[PDB]
């Protein structure tokens, strides 16, 4: 798709067989998703301060689908107030900025 | 142009006669630029944190050029470590996300 920026670029993503709303965030290097069940192994990271705040599971090799575009990469899964798709996954779906 | 996201979308902007590097940030509502002189009247504003963290100066109607594309809008000027071009300005240059 082509997404304008008049509103927050929130799209439906599929992750863990669930549909979630998430922000396409070119300002984010990485991807944070609301707490949910994902299969298997993950490592503890903390994020939210300069250093860290919020306990998130780093899951590698997570398949996410965005508007029909499958991407695999590292996802931080915890109580973020917003699901955020950063560049690590934006690049996987071929997402560019255009003007 | 078409900016891919393998790297941060840092571009050259021209503002107040000055050339700067700025992050094209779809996760940002507004545009914050590092401490500099602009000719307007401004309004004191607080941004960041939980109800305000840093004092910035809100300059309305500022002409800025983002990769050769002219836009006018509100620029906040303050101690930001990163010049951020938010959606308020990305929309003015007709910037879209595409995949």
């Amino acid at each position: 798709p082509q997404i304008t920026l008049w509103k927050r670029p929130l799209v439906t993503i599929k992750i863990g067989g669930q549909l979630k709303e998430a922000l396409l965030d070119t300002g984010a290097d990485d991807t944070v998703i609301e707490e949910m069940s994902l299969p298997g192994r993950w490592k503890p990271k903390m994020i939210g301060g300069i250093g860290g705040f919020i306990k998130v599971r780093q899951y590698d090799q997570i398949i996410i689908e965005i508007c029909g575009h499958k991407a695999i990469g590292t996802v931080l899964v915890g109580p973020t107030p917003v699901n955020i798709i950063g560049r690590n996954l934006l690049t996987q779906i071929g997402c560019t900025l255009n003007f | 142009p078409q900016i891919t996201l393998w790297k941060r979308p840092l571009v050259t902007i021209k503002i107040g006669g000055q050339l700067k590097e700025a992050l094209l940030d779809t996760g940002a509502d507004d545009t914050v630029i590092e401490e500099m002189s602009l000719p307007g009247r401004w309004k004191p504003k607080m941004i960041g944190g939980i109800g305000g963290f840093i004092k910035v100066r809100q300059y309305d109607q500022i002409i800025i050029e983002i990769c050769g594309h002219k836009a006018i809008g509100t620029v906040l000027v303050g101690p930001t470590p990163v010049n951020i071009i938010g959606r308020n300005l990305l929309t003015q240059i007709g910037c879209t996300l595409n995949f």
Partner: peptide, 4 residues
């Protein structure tokens, strides 16, 4: 915005 920064976010990562």
């Amino acid at each position: 915005a920064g976010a990562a």
